[PDB]
Amino acid sequence: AQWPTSYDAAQAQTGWVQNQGILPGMVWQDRDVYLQGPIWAKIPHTDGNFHP
Amino acid sequence: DGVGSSSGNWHCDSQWLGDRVITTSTRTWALPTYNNHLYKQISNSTSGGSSNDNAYFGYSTPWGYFDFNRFHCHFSPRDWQRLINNNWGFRPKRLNFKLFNIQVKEVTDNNGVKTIANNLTSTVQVFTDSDYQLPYVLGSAHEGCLPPFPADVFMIPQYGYLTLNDGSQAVGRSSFYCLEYFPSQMLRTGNNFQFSYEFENVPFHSSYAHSQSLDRLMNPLIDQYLYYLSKTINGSGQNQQTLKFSVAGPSNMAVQGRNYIPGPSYRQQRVSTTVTQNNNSEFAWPGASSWALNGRNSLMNPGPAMASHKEGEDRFFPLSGSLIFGKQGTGRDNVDADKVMITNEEEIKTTNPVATESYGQVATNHQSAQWPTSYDAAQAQTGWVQNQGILPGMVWQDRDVYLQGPIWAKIPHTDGNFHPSPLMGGFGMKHPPPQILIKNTPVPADPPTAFNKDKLNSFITQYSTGQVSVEIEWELQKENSKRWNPEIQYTSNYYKSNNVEFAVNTEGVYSEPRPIGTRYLTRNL
Amino acid sequence: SQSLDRLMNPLIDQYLYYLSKTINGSGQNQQTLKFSVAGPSNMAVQGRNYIPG
Amino acid sequence: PSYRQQRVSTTVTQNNNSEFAWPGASSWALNGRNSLMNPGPAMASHKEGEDRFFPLSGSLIFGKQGTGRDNVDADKVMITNEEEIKTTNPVATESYGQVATNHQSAQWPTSYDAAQAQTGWVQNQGILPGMVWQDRDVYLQGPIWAKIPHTDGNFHP
Amino acid sequence: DGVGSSSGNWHCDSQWLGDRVITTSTRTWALPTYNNHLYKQISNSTSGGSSND
Amino acid sequence: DGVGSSSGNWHCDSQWLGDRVITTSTRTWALPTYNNHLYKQISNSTSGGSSNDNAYFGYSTPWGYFDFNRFHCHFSPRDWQRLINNNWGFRPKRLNFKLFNIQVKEVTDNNGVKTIANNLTSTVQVFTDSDYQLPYVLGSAHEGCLPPFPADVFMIPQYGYLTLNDGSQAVGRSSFYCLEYFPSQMLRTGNNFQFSYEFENVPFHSSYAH
Amino acid sequence: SPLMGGFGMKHPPPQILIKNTPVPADPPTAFNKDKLNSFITQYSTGQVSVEIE
């Protein structure tokens, strides 16, 4: 709000989130498979992965 | 049945054992006739022309349901104090549910005077959705729970559900459920109903606060064997670039290397309880920080567990990042701040980011010196991180539970989820306690003496009452801390007052004066 | 057959409050704090346990 | 995942002629206190073909034998580099990628409404499904173990 | 008979098996007094003069 | 339950043995609805401005209690004469309590005329504070005991208790008790209640003069 | 020994509490979260027997 001096005061501002990573409490569905689509894939042999 | 015999007993107490506590609650309920025994399609168009964000399509059913998904339904205030002052964690194990002492009454309203009489031959239908084949509405923090005070008589809420909508219209994928399509038994006089359920394995709720912060886990006496960049120029300037490194360092704890980082964040607008400090503009929706789904904006209600405010300022709260309860007798439309109770998660500030602050800063360019040409050279620039997703090495605490807060929620049946702890607090399960549906069996009035194929729409006015008992066994996690100084404990204030806290007033109205958390004891890390 | 933002009971209010007004309107020094119950008519601001992926 | 770090060159003449160790540090805050994002998420130290660049605080820096403790030169310290994990982890001093920030549209009724496609830089990216990464390497002079903080939740501790 | 006891249950569902399906339906009925407990002879003449058909 | 069957009997007499006497008393009681099923905070301020000596703070409950803590509740005047004219001392040993023949009535008061009818499906809740977890008010010489004459019908008194007070105000140490926080069972039609108790060892009362 | 006369005990005969179970009147057909304050006017009567040796 105002408080000592004037220029310091500023209204609430928001920004757009174009990319969002995983957060706790998130839920989602994986991509659908198709009759012409692939069946399986090999998970790369790495130290870590998420939802492979 | 009969004057000299009952169909059920008292059963209202709490038993404390070594590592277990068993709570039993008994209440008296009243069940009216809902929707005149009809299923009705409902939508936002039936309540005027609203915005796209509030459009819905669903059905209202003549059934009622039992709700005890709140902690005060099972713990007395003193029992809650015993739980939170002596245990590091707790979790439900199994529950027992009983329905008994059914009484069905019929009402006649002729020429003004109203008469109520017993209807001994009427029935009440009860079933449990143990296969989770119906929409689950117990995880939306709705009213109609068992009253916290055992002496109160409560009304059973009406069951309704929503499905897919396009504005106020439906689509072919929308589902219609008839609750009479579930097994129906024939009952005699004096019957009772009961069933048991076992809670699936859930983690203990963290009913403690951390005595250490994530950025202060090092030894304050010993240096690290790691170096950090401390100087880039000698100072003065023309061509003074250099690279100097230093050891950190109890005197430079900020730049020390660390193994773990604070959990995820999602920026919320900051609101002050001192109204003169807020901006002189209407910002509740404009600065709400919401999320969108299929073109519909939904408020980011509490959301990720984040610290409510920085240290030394409890007058600030996130716009929609905290649970807000209403005081006893508080209205429902545009009430003042003194009529509501705003919770704060200040305990988790040791591991979770502040809800009204940026997660941190990140580099947004490549600093470069002169090199061929001049305009190409640019100083280092950073940008604010307003939302940060999960990163490896992240740690966080979940939202606290409250005496007036919800207990459990149903995890949506989807392909994937991450850390399915309910955002309003509690235990998230794939198979939560099943919904218990109840309804009065319709009793038609006198039909005409000539056959008519239309369904009957003239019934005897009836309602039912009875007693309901729910018993839940909880597992306890004891504390074995080596802390020397005394801990912080929840306690009542000795100072005199007109009324006793968590009691009834002169008019006989029970009230809960403040919200009670669970994080009073402390532990390291 | 259900959306993540429409999992609540459309007939029963929540026991949680949300900030609904910050000024009385007109202006010079009109800051205030008003809270409300949501609310089948205000499903957007209801508290929820899970969020989209 | 990634978390942008400032890029510093071992060739001092290539760096900006200004004092930036704290100002461009890329830190995180807790209870009003700023703490350096010391090494942090495991990310590739530099792009291929340039080992003269290192992240500001994204690498373990050991001291040589007999090295002092206050304001020592670069030749007195040993800067590690995680160049091996560049096959799966993002470069520490680069953006994770680009994302769309608007709706491209053609003409349609009126003119000013029309807008070309625009993209923005992603400086920090959290965990997403289908992500894979390698953890930070261990060293002969490095630590062996650590205690996971006793909290309600953590990810990949 | 009695408030605490019923004489019948829900029994309304359908069970699907390999080569069999079992359907169960339960409804509530109302039965009035018909014809004032009398048997009555009826004919087309009692409803006017109709055709031979 | 039923016309042809009762749930309890006469049981009103006194048996004299060698060194023991057994007294049995049966009375008919009436229990109204107290406090409109509410718990109410009470204090001296609610009854005007009294002196500091009479200040109090407590609660009134919708419960009633049974009182037989008077000698005429068990001894007839002739039985009392037999006791005091022939014995140097006496003391209680054990007691048996029974509640039976419960009848719940509902009252309708429309346009003046009052009608009373049976409510066969209603229940009455009874419990004993065998752990002494509630304030004890039977040792204050209060009214509401069983009438000395067996033929009299009496009203069950309302239960209330007091706690710590500072004038008409309360303090943090004050306790609030809810009687519904005790075990509650589901009852059918025609039930009865009974329990036994053994008196702890007490000295004989000196029923003599020196 | 009680000053008004009699036998003083640490564990005297326990208090026996009794109450009529409330029976609410007809509730409204629309849900309301407030506790019910409309009950059927009732009272109870019976017999009590106490035997002391």
Numbering used by the authors:
A (entry chain A): 587 to 588, 588A, 588B, 588C, 588D, 588E, 588F, 588G, ...
B (entry chain A): 219 to 588, 588A, 588B, 588C, 588D, 588E, 588F, 588G, ...
C (entry chain A): 429 to 481
D (entry chain A): 482 to 588, 588A, 588B, 588C, 588D, 588E, 588F, 588G, ...
E (entry chain A): 219 to 271
F (entry chain A): 219 to 428
G (entry chain A): 632 to 684
Sentences from the study reporting this entry:
Carbonic anhydrase IV (Car4) is a newly identified receptor that allows adeno-associated virus (AAV) 9P31 to cross the blood-brain barrier and achieve efficient infection in the central nervous system (CNS) in mouse models. Among the generated AAV9 variants with higher efficiency for infecting the CNS, the variant AAV9P31, which includes an additional sequence (WPTSYDA) inserted between Q588 and A589 of the wt AAV9 VP3 VR-VIII, exhibited efficient CNS tropism with 385-fold higher EGFP expression in the mouse CNS and 1000-fold higher EGFP expression in the mouse spinal cord compared to wt AAV9. Here we report the cryo-EM structures of AAV9P31 and its complex with Mus musculus Car4 at atomic resolution by utilizing the block-based reconstruction (BBR) method.
The structure of AAV9P31 was determined by cryo-EM with a final resolution of 1.76 Å at a 0.143 cutoff of Fourier shell correlation (FSC), and the side chains of VP3 capsomers were generally well defined. AAV9P31 has an additional seven inserted residues (WPTSYDA) between AAV9 VP3 Q588 and D589, which are numbered 588a to 588g. The main chain of the inserted peptide W588a-A588g is well defined in the density map.
